[PDB]
Structures are given as structure tokens and as C-alpha cells.
From a paper:
The resulting maps facilitated de novo model building for MDH, forming a tetramer of ~10 nm diameter. The tetramer is composed of two dimers related by dihedral (D2) symmetry. The peroxisomal targeting signal 1 (PTS1) motifs of all MDH subunits are found at the periphery of the tetramer and are equally accessible to the solvent. Additionally, the density was absent in the map of MDH tetramer solved in this study, further suggesting it originates from Pex5.
Having no protein synthetic abilities, peroxisomes import all required enzymes from the cytosol through a peroxin (Pex) import system. Peroxisome targeting sequence 1 (PTS1)-tagged cargo is recognized by cytosolic receptor, Pex5. MDH is a crucial enzyme for the glycolysis auxiliary pathway, maintaining the pool of malate/oxaloacetate.
Numbering used by the authors:
A (entry chain B): 1 to 88, 100 to 319
B (entry chain C): 1 to 88, 100 to 318
C (entry chain A): 1 to 88, 97 to 319
D (entry chain D): 1 to 88, 99 to 320
Write the structure that this text describes.
């Protein structure tokens, strides 16, 4: 009833994301993997785990890539969700533009989730590609940014033990400074000022901590696989009508905020985004910080939009 | 409550093992990670997932491996379950007997699980390692053999669709040909003779199939991580008195069978192996397969204990 | 999107069944409750639980009963599953008449629905429902089941009590549903079965547990908390198979075409998007179980004829 | 591991409360059912359900009740949580609550008491007086179940803000019909309006009479408090084993804080019971008038029940 495709499934992120998706997909679904190198090896590895009721499809790659690769054209028949996770800005921009053109040509009513690293710039890029073809729904393009909310939630639960909250709202952007946590809109007696400042700074520059631990080897591969798999399950469950979750995602604001591509709460549904909620009441400190984030996001959209 | 340690966690197989454990461990547990290189990087990677109730520790290795190191001893204090997944025959046998020596000197009352490649050979080596120390409980040494059950369940499920079974018994050994799937002891009308031979053969050489598709660049890693993590849930959940599961494993056989280290069903409890069950009824074809399998397993055991 | 209706929700078992169903139904499901008296209370009592995504409807019955109740006809539009648990030396007659009328009223507007029978004289009431559906003109032999999970629950509990740390998830039970017809197949389960002369006592206990419970109640009532646990599980299995989210294997008092000579035995089946899709053979049994089976079948044969003669 | 005793298990609320507790209790625990009439019928009814790892005990009552029932003295040995459910009004119900706490606390002075008897405003302080005569009284181990309001509040708001859904709604005050004050300003998302929040906040305060009206004066919400009572008990047992630290709203005793000694306020459960008492938090002007009035009514109920003990 649902078909989920992963683009770039033989990488570090794609391998772990694929394993978690297999263990949680509903009965009777189907998977689909694609990569230039390593797809056959990964495909005949998940076919041995029992997981009754799940079928795995497979499409091999090609010697150094050519535009509009023929193999991907037959893999994209009848696909409902595309998880575009491929890359290692200039090099990554071309890869995103190449893939969306091939995938959207066969299936034009599907949903897209962007997981490539500079989400601020590749999300608007994908909007231009769908405009040239002539098919574009603003309610079916989402940029995954749930990783920051996972870091904000963890950092507050370890400071107010044994008081535990499920989630924390985060708005703004998703790169380095455009992330702003709204710690005031959660139940409980917030710890103190001049300590929320240290916690708020940690969430923004938490990425550089992981790459420093690896001594410049890699990045936080395991974190985004968990964050990507959680968000992907939200879309499919809402697609079948088994949920109406309220999540935070980098979406296109139809009016609303002056910035056209802010990261604001939404309500998912059968047809995609269903409701766009206002940010809500915020304090003075979170007001000055938010106004600085919107300015930086403005340039990021334009720079990404210069390419395409 | 319960402390779980994964030795050799920065490898390709052990990285997916740790991620799966963090999402299933009970509230208030602990996770310990150790490897020679790359331990801190994995450590400050899972610490960012929220997962309230779980703490994470780690210990870093050093220059090319030396004998028993202080870093491994400090992490091993008060550890209930040890998962040994580390390696690259003689190269792996030397590594395994070193970690068990250093781990068992600080927590002799723990449960040891073996994940490394020569299962029929590394498991008796660890038992001979513990005897030399002075402490060895035959109910607290298990060799993981759940991958064969996962393969045999999938292959038989594809053939009898839409009939689904939760598990399939597998006895014998682990290497290539000692694996004997007992398809007669499952509920249902088995498809047909002269077809089960191919299915039983596919399970025997399923490992070689993955390496060929990888162009001889590696082996299965995503499938072995799932089996290793699933088995550790049974041991931990039973230790804290929340279940008593019946599993198949490559365990010691005191009395019972003639082979000193056959793989047979057991029942797990608050002290480890508490009840060993007989293999049960079999047919003629499976009896012949088990007769040849026993001969190779006996020879495999002797070679490992010699080392 | 699935519609599940519980007929007789204000009785002793209907209330617990409805409460158990409310917490397990899938998102977007709808629950209907009908009874002659007491339906509004159950309705605007269950509606105050959170249960996001589930709507609760109801239709109150009437005065001393009348045939073809107009409220039931209106409530039966757009229904997928019918869960029929409604009833009070002549206990059989009242229940048979009630079931006949209820099936006649419910199937006249939704012929493509599943019927589940939970009224106690199962062996005689299931062929009554089949014959009524035949009389109407619509009858699907893969969409008519009789719940028989209570005996399996009892057998599993007893055999797990016998063997201390060795647990099994289920136990095959074939035959019928009365006290002489239940026959557990203890040979087709893993492990070293305890001993002879200890299994006969267990089988007798499985057969007489109902009278044990009734007598323990000082002759005042019957088993209601246990009977409501089985119906909820069977209904969950049916709805999840119908929606396409599973294909499980169950034991139920279903029809058989061909196979056994007895028209309405209880054998393992596999459920699918169209109800039953594959009936399986009973399997290999030992000699002691064989002797029970031929005696079990004889009583079931005479049970079926009474129900058919009633119509 | 954990022994849970349900007092009054053969009643309308107790029977359904026991059925839900059998399906959700952790492996390795034990149930204990007691009542004056009908205990044997219920006890040998839940033992047929397999649920491997659970043992069901039983203890019959007596003739028309006598003080200090001997049968209730052996069952009280080893219990870890007591769920007082027996009931029929204030004069009759106060005698029953006073008798059972006296017998149970004399054998198991280190257990948790979860009062579910109907006059929660008046019966909770009564049990405090009973425990003081014996000489053992822990204020962190005595709680009153008032979770049926949060269930009613969440369902009513979620039916008007579709498709926006919240998991819980904070409710404080008391528990009868005027002492309930829901705090609808403390939830995420844009609140609907005014002059409609007034009708919603009022319905939560008069919902009990609506259930009785539908029954034509035959009963009350038996199924609702069974679900509410069973869900609340699971929080306490899990926090005793150390498997959770939930934050819940309950009618507890405050060691200072509010001037009213028995307000309903948020708390944090732990290994020893209540581990933290949290401030109510910011509220709006409209809800400020309701809360100030509610405290005045609550004060009478505490003193009305605390003088019956003498």
C-alpha cells in the first residue's frame, strides 16, 4: 500500500536508515534502494532478515554517473515517498538537481523529503526543478530538521532530573545560527537564566563536537539516521490515515512569515501538510535571537536560488 | 540496574549493534563501549539521542594492541553482560582469548556472549581461557547462533506464502555444512520433497552468496548486527527477572550429548542456563545430516582447544 | 477506516468487550453500540476517554422486544464487522430465536459484512446463522466464524502451570465447544510433555473448567471477565486481517467444504482480505488423541442437526 | 517483585479495574483481591486467562461486616500498593474507609494508598487521621485519584480543535463539581476563542450529572473510573520498580506551599512515592477568579471530614 524509495542507500547514512526502516514499516509495504556503487551488496543483506510482509526491490548503479540514468527510470514507478539522502555546496547542488529531475518525471504526485546536508539551500533548489517540469505542490516538499529538536530535548532533561519532557519546540533554520530553541513554551519551572544561555548555545554548535571527536574523520552518521527514520515514519503513517502528527519541518510558508522558507510547526495529513500553525507567544530574549536568524536565512535562499 | 558492555564497538558490525541496543534497553540501564580506535567518536554520537533513562560511557584504546590494558579493566567493573564482537583463524583466536582474560578478572560472575567468526572454535577457546583463571560456570557462556534461524525462517516463509511461522529450530553447528535446519518440527504442511534439499542447501551456503554480490569486498554486516542485538535482549531481560525465554544457542553440554559443545535449545533464567532440553524427534534425512555434522564439529572443537 | 458494531453492549460481557475494544481499535475507526435497554449510558460513558481518532455512536433499543427494530436497521448501514454477543433446560430456544432475528435484521442492509458469533451454544447457533443467510440469498462461507479461543486460553494456562519455566504461546484445540467435544492436541507443541496419567487430568480440567467457575460463584452467575477477553482478541485479528495489516493463523468454528465429513468442525484457518483464504489439515496425532476425536465428532454431528432442524 | 491488593474487587468498578490490571502488570508480579461478597467468583475467573508470570491470590470476606476482619489480616501481609475502591452517603462511606485503612495499615505500614472512594475531597483527609492514631503516617505515600477530570478535559478540547491533538490537559483544584478548574491556557496551539471556552470549562464541571441523567438514575460512570483508576495505578507501580518517573496530577498533602492543606497539584513520582511538588504556574485573569473561589469551598470539605474522625 506504500512504497518508499531511498536514494543513496549504500553510504554511511543510507545503510543505517535502511535498516531501521525495515524494522518499523507496516505489514504489506515495499522498499526500494538505489546507488551508483554498492546497491547489490546491501540489497542482498536485508533479504535474509525475516520481517514477514516486507519486500525489497533493487536497482544497480552505473560507471561514473551520466545525467538521467536509465536504471532509476524504472525504479521510480509507483513510488509514494522519496528520501533524497546523497552527497559527500557546489558538488551537492548538482546531485540534488540531477536526482529530482529523474524521479519527478515518472512519478509527479509523490512526496519528497530532503536529508542532504545544507538543508537551507537545497530545499529551495528542489522547488525550482519542479517548476520547470510544470508539476509542483508546496504541501509535498519537506526539509528534515528533526535532529536539532532531539538535541534540545536531551540537553534539558539532564538539567532538570527527574523532571522529563517529551519534546522541545525549535524554529528558525537548520545550519549554524538560524536554529533557535523556544525553551519558554514547555511545562515546568525552567532552571535559571545565564544557564539557559549555555544550553541554547550548545544546541546551535553541537555538530562541531562530533566531528572533533572523530579527529576530522567523519560526521554524526548515527544521529541523522535515527532522526531521518523517525521523520520518515511520520509521513507514511499520516499518508495511510493512521495519524495526524504535529511536527517541525523546513517548509514553504504560503504567506505568513516574510521569509518564504521558514522552519515552523505544521500538521500532516493524507494530502501532506494540512495546517500551518503560528509560532506562538515568545519572550524578549527569544525575540531578538529570532530576528537575527531570519536575516541569515534570507541570504541562504537567494544563494541557493542563484544556482538554478 | 543492568550494565551492558560491547567490546569492539567502532567496527562496521559493532556500530549498528550499539545503535539498536540504545533504543531497546530498559529504563535506568547503562551502555559501555570500547575499541582501540574510534571509541570516542561513536560515544559522543549516541549521547545526542534523547532516550531518557539511559546513560552512556566509553573507554578509548591506544597504539597497536598490547596485552591487558588498564582502560579495559576500568570499564569492566560491575558489568553484567559482555558482548565480544572484535576481530578482522589464528589472528582471531589470539584476540578473543585476550579480551576474555582481562574482562573476567574484574567481573567473573558475568555472562559472556561470542559473536566472532569461528563460532565452533572460538567458543571452546573462551571456555578453556576461563578454566585457567579459576572461575568457570558452564551456564554463563553462550555462543550466538541466531543468524541461521533468521535465514531459515525467511526462506521457508517465501515458499509457503501466505503461511507465516515465528521461528524455526536449527541444531548442529555454525560453519558451513554442520547447519541442520529441522523443518519437520514446525506447524504446517511442508511444501514437497526434492525442494527442501535446495532450501536446506541455500541456508548452508547463504554466507557465500552475500560475499559474491559484494565482489569479495566484505561479508554480511547489517544482518549480523540485528541477530546479535536481538539475542542480547533475551539475556538481559531474563537476568532482571522479567522473562524466561527458550532460545537455541551453541552452549556447553554437560553429560547429555556426546559432543562437548553442541548447539541445542535451552531455557534462560536469573542465573543463566537453567534447563537443557533434548533435541527431540527427527526423520531419517535429518538423522544422516546430523551424523556427518557431528563428526566435523568434533574435529572443529579439538583444533580450537589445541590453540 | 473500519466500522465495528457490538450487538448487545449493555449486557454483562458486552460492556467489558466494548471497553477492551475501545483501547485497541486502529486510528480512524468507528464503534457502534446497540441494546434494548442501557445503550445510552454505555455510549455517554465511554465517550469521556481520550482515545484520539475514534468516534462512538449508539442507537437505543425499544420497549419489550419487537422484530426488525428500526433503530438497528439505521445503525447497520455501512458496517464491516458484526460482533453478536446477546442472550439471557430451554436456554437454547431463546438464544436461537434471538440470533435468528438479529442476523435477519443486520444482514438485510450490509450483505458484504463479517459475522462473529459469541453466544454460548456455538455448535447449534453457527449453523442457524448460516441457514438464515442462506434464506436471505447472500451467504459467504469465508465470512462466518465462531469464536473458540477460550478453550485455547485455558489449555495454555494449565499446561504452562504444569511445566515450571517452559512456556508456550498457544496450544492447538480442535473438535467443538461443549464439554465432551473439546480435545487439546498436546503432542504438537515443543518440549518434553510431562507424563502420562498427568495429561488425562489436565484434559478433564480443560473440559470442566466452565462448571468449575460456575460452581465457584455459588450458583449465581458465570464467567464474564474471561469470556470478554477472547472475543476482543478474535475481533482484533479479524479487523487487522481485513484492513490488510496481517495474515494470521487462528482456530475457529468455521465451515468446511470437502475436507472432513463433519460439515461444521473447528480447524485451523488463515485469514485474509476476503475472510478465510486457506483451510489447513489437522495434522499428525497420536493414538490417545485419535480416540477422543471420533467421540468428539459424533456429538458434533447431532449438535448440527438440531440447529438446522430449528430453522 | 510487586504485590498489588485491590480492596472491594467484586463491585462494579472493582471488577473492570481488576481485568485491566491483569493485562498490563509486569511479568513476575502478583494480584490480591478481597471483598465481603463475591470474591471466590471473581478470583477463579481471571486465573483462566493465561498471562504467564502472574499469580492471583484470594481472600473471602465474612458475614455482615465486623470490625477487624480476620481474613483481611493475612492478605495484608507483603502488599506494596493498596487500592481502596469499596463504597456504597458521606456518613456511610466514611465508616467503610475508616475501617479498611485501620486493618491494612496495622499489617503493612510501608505501603502506598490510592483512595478511589467517591468523596475524594472528604475521604482523603479522613485516612490521614486514621493513620495518625496508629502512629505511622507518610505524606509521600498517600494519594487520591482524581485523573478522571484530565480524561474529560482532553477529550472535550480535542473535539473542537480538530485535527490538532494534545496528549494531556492540566487540571487543579478539587474534585466534586465546582472545585474543578481546567487550565486551558497551558497547552500548545491557538486556543479556540472566548465565550466558547466558558461552555467547555463548564461542561467539565457538570459532566457527572450528564452520565447519571442518561441512566435515568440507575448508576454512575463505572467504566470511566475503572479506566482512570487502572491507568493511575500503573504509574505508581512502575515508579516503585524504578522503570519510570512520571509527572501526574493528584489530590495530595502539601508540606507547606499552598495554604490549603489538601489541594490537587502536579507531583513527580519516584521510588519512595512523591519526589517533588511543583508550583502551579502562570494563569490568566479569568481562571484566577475560579481558583480563588474553589479554595474557599475546598476548605470546608477538609474540615467537614476531619471532624468526623473525632
Amino acid at each position: 500500500m506504500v512504497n518508499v524509495a531511498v536514494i543513496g542507500a549504500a553510504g554511511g547514512i543510507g545503510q543505517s536508515l535502511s535498516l531501521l526502516l525495515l524494522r518499523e514499516l507496516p505489514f504489506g509495504s515495499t522498499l526500494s534502494l538505489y546507488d551508483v556503487v554498492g546497491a547489490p551488496g546491501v540489497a542482498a543483506d536485508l533479504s535474509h532478515i525475516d520481517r514477514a510482509g516486507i519486500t525489497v526491490k533493487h536497482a544497480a548503479g552505473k560507471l561514473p554517473p551520466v545525467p538521467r540514468d536509465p536504471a532509476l527510470t524504472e525504479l521510480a514507478e509507483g513510488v509514494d515517498v522519496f528520501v533524497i539522502v546523497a552527497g559527500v555546496f557546489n558538488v551537492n547542488a548538482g546531485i540534488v538537481m540531477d536526482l529530482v529531475l529523474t524521479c519527478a518525471s515518472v512519478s509527479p504526485n509523490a512526496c519528497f523529503c530532503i536529508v542532504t546536508n545544507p538543508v537551507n539551500s537545497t530545499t529551495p533548489i528542489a522547488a525550482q526543478t519542479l517548476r520547470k517540469i510544470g508539476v509542483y505542490n508546496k504541501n509535498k516538499l519537506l526539509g528534515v530538521s528533526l535532529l536539532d529538536g532531539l538535541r534540545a530535548t536531551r540537553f534539558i532533561n539532564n538539567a532538570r532530573h527527574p523532571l522529563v519532557v517529551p519534546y522541545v519546540p525549535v524554529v528558525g533554520g537548520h545550519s549554524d545560527v538560524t536554529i533557535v530553541p523556544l525553551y519558554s513554551q514547555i511545562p515546568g519551572p525552567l532552571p535559571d537564566e545565564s544557564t539557559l544561555k549555555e544550553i541554547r548555545k550548545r544546541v546551535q554548535v553541537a555538530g562541531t563536537e562530533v566531528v572533533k571527536a572523530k579527529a576530522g574523520r567523519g560526521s554524526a552518521t548515527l544521529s541523522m539516521a535515527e532522526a531521518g527514520a523517525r521523520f520518515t515514519m511520520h509521513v507514511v503513517k499520516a499518508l495511510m490515515g493512521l495519524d495526524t502528527p504535529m511536527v517541525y519541518a523546513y517548509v514553504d510558508t504560503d504567506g505568513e512569515h516574510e521569509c518564504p522558507f521558514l522552519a515552523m510547526p505544521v500538521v500532516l495529513g493524507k494530502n501532506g501538510i494540512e495546517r500551518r500553525l503560528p509560532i506562538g507567544p515568545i519572550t524578549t530574549v527569544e525575540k531578538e535571537m529570532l530576528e537575527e536568524a531570519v536575516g541569515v536565512v534570507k541570504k541562504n535562499i537567494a544563494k541557493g536560488e542563484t544556482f538554478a
